[PDB]
Design a protein around this ligand. Structure first.
Ligand SMILES: CC(=O)N[C@H]1[C@@H](O[C@H]2[C@@H](O)[C@@H](CO)O[C@H](O)[C@@H]2O[C@@H]2O[C@@H](C)[C@@H](O)[C@@H](O)[C@@H]2O)O[C@H](CO)[C@H](O)[C@@H]1O
Ligand SMILES: CC(=O)N[C@H]1[C@@H](O[C@H]2[C@@H](O)[C@@H](CO)O[C@H](O)[C@@H]2O[C@@H]2O[C@@H](C)[C@@H](O)[C@@H](O)[C@@H]2O)O[C@H](CO)[C@H](O)[C@@H]1O
Lengths: 306, 305
């Protein structure tokens, strides 16, 4: 019934857009470029949106069966299941199977197989793999993605899991763009059932992000993945399902030792945070700090500058 | 009031390896001691052993590679706490939090991102393995050694190990989920361990949340059993509800039909027992989950599961 947040420091939080811990808080200058991530989307009354599911280990993961190979760089055709192993239904009201990556780039990690049926049941293998979300075969909404793997001679048409490790630019100039959605149904097709874009409306306000610097596999990319709210908050809201009393929950970032409030922010009903600030700024805050719910306010509440 | 999160098996994460729970399993009582160090937490929210809060910290390492040796476990990784803070070997823990708690090989990837003067911001990643049998697996002392696939592209720089799965080693060191590694040297006892767990009521057995994790070759089933799932640990940590007795009676319910399917003892120190005899993979509806019933005590007589 009453709304609340879990009590967790930054290093006790997991990025909802990639399965790594949160490193820092960041507020971004408002730009023409649209924020419309599909992972890490959840209302304050606990409605998961976009491709959001509950498990950190589901974020940017795939599960399915490899069924074919093609003579293209994205060689191995992986027919997808839901992450829990149930049959994926392409007519479901989602942009893609839950956990699908929500950015343009290459996700690198490992694939693992475990055979079932007649052909060496129980036999296993694992190796490095990449998934390009630029690929014309990246069609997860339709029910498949194609994989690039390091050893084409040790891979079978068997149950397969992709475990993500990090991200990068592709090596042919297709850059890692965290705010550009992939085409979940491929070239010439438009995305559907998307979680809506988010932006501050109030003047002087900017989005606040929970920022992670994820692993990269070569070159100098910083590996920045920003999420709106951390996975643990999504998990908490899902459990609680506290009805939202207004469009905005006022929240305070507190220092629990000294008891002082360091700044305040607007946590919007649809599950994102704004602050009163101008310019890009990595926040300077004590390590023990965390947000607490203060009160229900509205869109036009005037935040103390941060 | 004490409570459990409301989560189906496929909405739960193994607290001993970063994968979802596949099933429930009760095991015949054996001479072999159950004393896992990850996935350990009291019902009042006290994390124990090497347990920390993040699924992505389980069997992960963070640190700096500082040297290489002419051994199979070639690359010496000096460890930090998973949040990047300095590891203190005199801390009252068995090892840095998240360290693997079994004998075997963990396979995954290492990634580096340079800092300081030498090409700061440059990165690289590749396949790597950590053997917990290794004489250089001394995480309590502050280091582990890594085997990697490409010895020519690896620097003395900040390094993260991301686990993907487990296996037997290739040479007579099998994956043994219930054998603790030596967190310090070969002749040094482990310390600050979370205690062993066993049923002590007659007719009772441990109940496990079971996952079949990825393996990298051969036929190993990849079984990792945890006492309580990561989400319960996270929940107890938040709640810190005072425990009113040594045992919380819990019921596995079907939420659609409202029926209770069986009951179990959730002990204060954070493990579950059931009245059953023999190894048994439970067969239970997919929508099912545990709910807290009431505080009881050690002598409570469970309905047979
Ligand atoms: C295919 C190949 O030659 N791999 C080498 C190579 O990798 C380079 C190379 O791909 C260039 C191309 O523009 O981009 C990088 O420099 C890449 O190296 C990676 O990124 C640099 C900054 C380093 O961090 C490096 O360790 C990393 O691998 O050269 C490197 C050696 O520098 C490796 O030897 C690759 O195997
Ligand atoms: C050629 C090479 O160096 N490695 C192959 C090799 O890998 C085998 C091998 O290490 C044997 C040891 O005698 O143990 C395994 O069988 C291993 O293969 C792995 O496990 C089997 C059951 C298969 O599932 C297999 O796909 C998996 O790689 O053989 C395999 C091919 O059979 C690979 O080609 C390796 O690269």
């Amino acid at each position: 019934k009453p709304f609340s947040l879990p009590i967790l420091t930054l290093s006790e939080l997991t990025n909802s857009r990639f399965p790594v811990p949160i490193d820092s808080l960041f507020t971004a200058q408002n730009n023409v470029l649209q924020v419309q991530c599909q992972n890490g989307r959840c209302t304050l009354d606990g409605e998961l949106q976009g491709t959001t599911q509950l498990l950190p280990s589901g974020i940017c993961a795939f599960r399915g069966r490899v069924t074919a190979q093609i003579n293209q760089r994205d060689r191995w055709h992986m027919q997808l299941q839901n992450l829990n192993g149930t049959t994926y239904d392409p007519t479901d009201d989602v942009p893609a199977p839950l956990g699908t990556p929500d950015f343009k780039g290459v996700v690198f990690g490992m694939v693992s197989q475990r055979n079932v049926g007649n052909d060496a049941p129980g036999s296993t293998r694992a190796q490095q793999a990449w998934v390009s979300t630029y690929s014309p075969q990246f069609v997860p909404k339709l029910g498949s993605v194609n994989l690039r793997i390091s050893d084409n001679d040790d891979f079978q048409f068997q149950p397969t899991k992709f475990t993500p490790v990090g991200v990068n630019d592709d090596d042919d100039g297709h850059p890692f763009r965290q705010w550009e959605l992939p085409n979940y149904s491929g070239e010439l097709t438009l995305n559907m059932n998307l979680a809506p874009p988010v932006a501050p409306n109030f003047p002087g306000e900017q989005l606040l992000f929970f920022r992670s610097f994820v692993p990269c596999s070569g070159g100098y990319n910083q590996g920045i993945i920003d999420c709106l709210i951390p996975q643990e908050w999504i998990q908490h809201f899902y459990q609680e399902s506290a009805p939202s009393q207004s469009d905005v929950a006022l929240i305070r970032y507190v220092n629990p030792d000294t008891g002082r409030t360091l700044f305040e922010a607007k946590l919007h009903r649809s599950g994102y945070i704004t602050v009163a600030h101008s310019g890009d700024y990595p926040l300077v805050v004590p390590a023990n700090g965390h947000f607490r719910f203060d009160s229900w306010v509205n869109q036009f509440y005037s935040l103390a500058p941060m």
